[PDB]
Structure 1
Amino acid sequence: DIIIATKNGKVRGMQLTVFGGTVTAFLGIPYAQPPLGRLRFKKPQSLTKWSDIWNATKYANSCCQNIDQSFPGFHGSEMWNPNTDLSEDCLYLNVWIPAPKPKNATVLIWIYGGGFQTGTSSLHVYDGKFLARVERVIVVSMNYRVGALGFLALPGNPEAPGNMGLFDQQLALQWVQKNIAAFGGNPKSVTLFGESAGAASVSLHLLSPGSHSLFTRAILQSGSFNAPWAVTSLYEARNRTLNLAKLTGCSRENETEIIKCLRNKDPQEILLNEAFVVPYGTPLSVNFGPTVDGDFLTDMPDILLELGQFKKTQILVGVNKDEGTAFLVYGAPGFSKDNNSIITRKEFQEGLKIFFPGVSEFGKESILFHYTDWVDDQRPENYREALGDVVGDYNFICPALEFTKKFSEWGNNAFFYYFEHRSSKLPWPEWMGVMHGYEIEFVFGLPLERRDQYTKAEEILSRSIVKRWANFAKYGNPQETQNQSTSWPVFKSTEQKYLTLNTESTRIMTKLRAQQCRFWTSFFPKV
């Protein structure tokens, strides 16, 4: 029986057997008042205290969200859907600690992605018990509000100020600062890690002055806030909140009255209307996301980044080889997960209209010009591959590389990786390659479980990544020092060294996607 006294009252955890050892899991500890009734769309309010023992022995409710129903019955998409009940009452977090209880362990805090519209901390691929067992770190993860309920903004109105889900994340970081030592953790050694919108969130904690003293360092897997889907302008945010009011019968002349009417709607009516607040969207649309609220975020984040106004610390950033392919089967014409998706030039063109809907004809022709000068045979897959690369370079890889360059120019060590291993169990088809999201299970150590039929080469790859990530959290340096491994060099402007992650051989390379990123970074923003 493991019972821990926190600042809000006692919590009871449970013992898990993991690889011949034990891990103690405390699943579903509350970290804020449930944001119901009058609290809907406000910043999270802090917890009052319980007398008695809170049983943290099962995952809590996931936050309200739309679900992906594009492939019912299919593991490749269903594994990202929420696996506990959906509820507005969803502000909880999970703690995994080594047994015996550690003395001052480094803490890894995971922030899930999902476009800021979806996601939950309870998915199988985010289970922190392997990292706790193998590296003797404490792993923490939280649920945070998503969609309009997390990110609706009428900027400057404290009834719906924006960024509520980022404030939920921040309050969970505060919870670790105040309580993690009772679990054996060191509040002075806390690394954030997250993937896609979870990575963009981590990068915004580097910018937010209220997060500055709540963590030590940061890991960004496939995402950063300069990615084109990550931050909503003030103008589109007010537009979208007003469209949402229109669609739900809540248009009013007084803005505080709009919010009060939105607070009377059942969650389902809000969720049903979210897709439509925008005149056209894409597979990557973030309808309700982070905004410049003058609170969490004090200025446009591209200005803060450019002028060095962010926490000075080490970062670990990287991307997967085929980031853009997952998105093509959610609307590009000619694509299917159930065939080889060979498309024509005309299809490629229609595909750019799907992913770049507000963009000029010239802008879309510029994309086609840059990506279709082929090397070289008339390969059938030319256009299929070009579209996946357009979408992955624009939305993920070039923005991660630009973020890492700009961050590292202010004097801190940064380490960049390119993940290029396709999981032997991947249920999506071969043409999609090394997809977005599919490094996560290697990071959390799932291939360390021999019972699961990953290959031996994947066990070794995951074991090495897990060690590099734990060394980065503990020591700021993501080396694997014992097994004659390739040394991971810092990423600097000028040389731009990165490390490739694969089952065969790790290589130091330079200037990832140089010619493509010059296009997206220096030309495309003009268009």
Structure 2
Amino acid sequence: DNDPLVVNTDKGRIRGITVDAPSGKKVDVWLGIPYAQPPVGPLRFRHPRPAEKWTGVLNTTTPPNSCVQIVDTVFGDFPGATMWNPNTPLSEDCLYINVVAPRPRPKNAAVMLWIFGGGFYSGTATLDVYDHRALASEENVIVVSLQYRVASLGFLFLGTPEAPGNAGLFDQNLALRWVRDNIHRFGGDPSRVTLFGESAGAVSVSLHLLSALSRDLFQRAILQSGSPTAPWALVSREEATLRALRLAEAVGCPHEPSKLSDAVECLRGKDPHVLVNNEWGTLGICEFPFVPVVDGAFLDETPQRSLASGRFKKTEILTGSNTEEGYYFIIYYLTELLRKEEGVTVTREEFLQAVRELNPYVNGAARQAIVFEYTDWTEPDNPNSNRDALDKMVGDYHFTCNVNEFAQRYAEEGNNVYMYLYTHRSKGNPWPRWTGVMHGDEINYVFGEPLNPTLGYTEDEKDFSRKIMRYWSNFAKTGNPNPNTASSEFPEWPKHTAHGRHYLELGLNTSFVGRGPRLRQCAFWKKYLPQLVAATSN
């Protein structure tokens, strides 16, 4: 056939459609290419199974279903909240891929594969924030996004072959194999596959760097605000089984560590929505109920021991954090203090109580070490300082420091690393101005949302998006974000070396290069506090 919009995948034929990007430029899109058998009925919790081949031609012109998940109604129809809520119908049948190619269709181009992050409980590839149209048309790259099972439906673990765990990761893995097989027909290059994700999506990307089954399915990796060594990224096999039995109990099912086949069978019987809506029990800040676990097949050792032994892919890494990683999660947790309102502050007394609520597992001597490390000593009682203190102690421990650790290990094992610190507030930020540059703020800019003129981004912000969009893309191409010509509009990004530890600051009016970021506090969490908790355990 001579129609370019149709493509012959290894399992059948699909038809795409030509759509114009908000930039005016046009791209070809294929939306909702099935990569697996719908994981319904007896297949729930279990690993994905390759899609059955189909007769005739399939219309891949519609954004696919998103996986069954919780919806965020906490702040109602607040744009800053609803933008992360699913914009397609919720279904168990959600395992699909989206492919976007620039026009004219490139001969053989690098492919950027987006694994979304939703803390392993939420998310969809169809979110308007992740728009491939802009990234593809502007950087001349194949942009690909996959859907993966999320929450317990994707991460329930019991130890039995009935609930093996990491089902969502296997969903991603199968989708990666699909890309190697089929991406060339779109103008892709199965050799040059760059994985990029944010938060839990970046955690995923990192696990694919570690995984045996995922090793030779991609080339490079970009990791936004995520790391496999993060406290929330994994959960012990023992806890994961208890979390599952708690879900069984809360939903009405039998809960007995003796007979687990009864639990899974009953759980496969209950409603998907009824299932996901009961996962949330007594959890502290930044801990999610159903996440990856060391299963033996996808991962046979904790990311700690994989990093320590150097057992991870040898390839280039682009990673980094935002300035206020903590605030987002403190806003949803800990809700009476830090309300969604302008000019929020924290009294010294309130701050003292907060470090107890935000680190519920430490002994007090460790708490006092936390209060000392995170208080501003020029002005200890300052209400602004004490609020920002809460952001940093959450943001460092759960995000910034883990990204640093992963970036360092990769560097000292001989790999080229490119670290960033994202310091940019959008003018049109819907959140209170004390929140600053929060978790996931960079996403709008990497996907080239400022280029959409219907959203009144400033002209400087439009240049800024194009700037980091370039860094990202030509890292995916060359393994180095810096252009070949070394331009003025694209400042130099030094390699994050094992000794130097340099990062580029990504902001409007800067080319600043620091060392870190936040090396002292990251040493506090990784070095000092562990040995203090070890000494004061009795």
TM-score, normalization by structure 2 = 0.95
Find the counterpart in structure 1 of residue 425 from structure 2: 422
- Aligned pairs for 1:155-304 (under 5 A) are 155=159, 157-248=160-251, 249-252=253-256, 253-276=258-281, 280-304=282-306
Matched, 1:489 2:494: yes
- Which residues of structure 1 form unaligned runs of 5+? none
- Alpha-carbon distance, 1:481 to partner: 4.4
TM-superposition CA deviations, 1:468-489 (whole Å, max 9, x none): 1111000000114453232111
**SS of alignment partner, residue 107 of structure 2:** coil
Q: How many angstroms does 1:184 deviate by?
A: 1.0
- Stretch moving more, 228-237 or 194-203: 228-237
Q: Secondary structure at the match of 2:31?
A: strand
- Could you tell me which amino acid in structure 2 is paired with residue 198 of structure 1? G
Separation in 2, partners of 1:52, 1:518: 59
Corresponding residue SS for 1:273: coil
* 1:331-355 deviations in Å (ceiling 9; x for gaps): 3242112132211122112322332
Aligned match of 2:145 in 141, 144, 148? 141
Note if contact 1:331-1:354 (Cα within 8 Å) is conserved in structure 2. no
Which of 369, 372, 378 is equivalent to 1:369? 372
- Aligned-partner Cα distance in 2 for 1:78–1:374: 38
| 2:58 equivalent to 1:54 | yes
Question: C-alpha separation between the residues in 2 aligned to 1:432 and 1:448?
Answer: 24
Counterpart pick for 2:506 among 460, 478, 501? 501
Closer, same or farther in 2 for the Cα pair 1:237/1:525, shift >3 Å? farther
AA at the equivalent of 2:290? F
Aligned partners of 1:228 and 1:75: how far apart in 2? 29
Counterpart amino acid of 1:417? Y
Deviation at 1:282? 2.7
Q: Aligned equivalents of 2:337 and 2:269: distance in 1? A: 43
> What is the match of residue 41 of structure 2?
37
Indicate conservation of the 8 Å contact 2:464/2:508, yes or no: yes
Contact 1:464 1:480 in 2 (8 A): no
Worse-matched range after superposition: 328-337 or 139-148: 328-337
User: Match of 2:351, SS?
Assistant: helix
Equivalent in the alignment of 1:21? 25
Q: Deviations over 1:12-60 (max 9, x none)?
A: 1111112343100111111000000010000000011011111111111
Query: Could you tell me which residue of structure 1 aligns to residue 329 of structure 2?
Result: 327
How many Å separate the matches in 1 of 2:459 and 2:182? 39
Stretches of 4+ aligned residues off by more than 6 angstroms: none
User: Which residue of 2 is the match for residue 125 of structure 1?
Assistant: 129
8 Å CA contact 1:374, 1:382 repeated in 2: no
Q: Write out aligned runs for 1:322-361 (5 A).
A: 322-332=324-334, 333-361=336-364
Q: Residue 6 of structure 1: CA displacement?
A: 0.7
Please say if 1:441 is aligned against 2:449. Answer: no
Q: Which residue of 1 aligns with 2:519?
A: 514
**How far apart are the structure 1 equivalents of 2:78 and 2:530?**
37
How far apart are 1:295 and its partner, in Å? 0.6
- On the 8 A contact 2:32/2:61 being kept in 1, the answer is yes
Instruction: Give the counterpart letter for 2:529 in structure 1.
Output: F
Q: Percent identity?
A: 48
Partner of 1:92: 96
Partner letter of residue 304 of structure 1? S
- For residues 113-160 of structure 1, what are the alpha-carbon distances to aligned partners after superposition, in whole Å with 9 as ceiling and x for unaligned? 1110111100011111111101110011011011111100112x2211
The amino acid that maps onto 1:59 is P
Matched letter for residue 521 of structure 1? K
Per the TM alignment, residue 359 of structure 1 is displaced from its structure 2 partner at its CA by: 2.8
Give 2:79's aligned residue: 75
What's the CA shift for 1:379? 3.3
**Contact between 2:376 and 2:386, CA under 8 Å: does it hold in 1?**
no
Q: Check if 1:455 corresponds to 2:455.
A: no
Instruction: Give the SS at the match of 1:146.
Output: coil
Deviations 1:58-108 (A, max 9, x none): 111100111111100100111111111111110011100011221101000
Q: SS of the residue aligned with 1:25?
A: strand
Give the AA of the match of 1:379: N
Q: What TM-score results when the alignment is normalised by the length of structure 1?
A: 0.97
Letter in 2 for 1:105: A
Q: What is the CA–CA distance in structure 2 between the aligned matches of 1:196 and 1:132, rounded to whole Å?
A: 22
1:250–1:262: 8 Å Cα contact kept in structure 2?
no
Q: Which runs of 5+ in 2 are unaligned?
A: 534-538
Deviation at 1:378, TM superposition (A): 5.4
For the residue of structure 2 that corresponds to 1:144, the secondary structure is: coil
Letter in 2 for 1:374: W
Q: 1:71 to 1:283 in 2, by over 3 A?
A: farther
Sort the Cα spacing of 1:134 and 1:257 in 2 relative to 1 into closer, same or farther, 3 A.
same
- The worse-fitting range, judged by mean Cα deviation, of 249-258 and 174-183 is 249-258
For the aligned residue pairs, the C-alpha RMSD in angstroms reads 1.4
Are the aligned partners of 2:194 and 2:222 in contact in 1 as well (CA < 8 Å)?
yes
